Amino acid sequence: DAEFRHDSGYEVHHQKLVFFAEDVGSNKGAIIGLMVGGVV
Ligand SMILES: OC[C@H]1O[C@@H](Oc2cc(/C=C/c3ccc(O)cc3)c3c(c2)O[C@H](c2ccc(O)cc2)[C@H]3c2cc(O)cc(O)c2)[C@H](O)[C@@H](O)[C@@H]1O
Ligand SMILES: OC[C@H]1O[C@@H](Oc2cc(/C=C/c3ccc(O)cc3)c3c(c2)O[C@H](c2ccc(O)cc2)[C@H]3c2cc(O)cc(O)c2)[C@H](O)[C@@H](O)[C@@H]1O
């Protein structure tokens, strides 16, 4: 039988940064990049 205890780890109440608890990432799809030299 394992005894679970929490005493020392991470103790930070006010964060000095914009703390967004969400996965930030825009769905773009198509990106610009025209490269046609000799044989493409
Ligand atoms: O030290 C770098 C800057 O730290 C900032 O505080 C910080 C120091 C550290 C953590 C310090 C840590 C230290 C030793 C160690 O063995 C382990 C972790 C972390 C901070 C801020 O926010 C992170 C945070 C807090 C709450 C969450 O729910 C999630 C993340 C935390 C964090 C944790 C982590 O697992 C990995 C990280 O890269 C960051 C200060 O405000 C700045 O002044 C300082 O320049
Ligand atoms: O998939 C990640 C691994 O593969 C490779 O990257 C990649 C980075 C990114 C895209 C990066 C992106 C970045 C910024 C941004 O604003 C927008 C899009 C994407 C990859 C691979 O394949 C996706 C792909 C390619 C052709 C298709 O016909 C369909 C999908 C593409 C993709 C597009 C998308 O609209 C949404 C996605 O989640 C992924 C790299 O080797 C590494 O990043 C990594 O190993």
UniProtKB/Swiss-Prot annotation:
It is found in: Cell surface. The record marks 35 as: Susceptible to oxidation. Changing residue 21 to G: In AD1; Flemish mutation; increases the solubility of processed amyloid-beta peptides and increases the stability of peptide oligomers. Changing residue 35 to V: No free radical production. No hippocampal neuron toxicity. Cu(2+) 2 binds at residues 6, 10, 13-14. Residues 24-40 are annotated as: Interaction with PSEN1. Zn(2+) 2 binds at residues 6, 10, 13-14. The record marks 1-2, 7-8, 16-17, 19-20 as: Cleavage. It comes from the Eukaryota. This is Amyloid-beta protein 40. It comes from Homo sapiens.
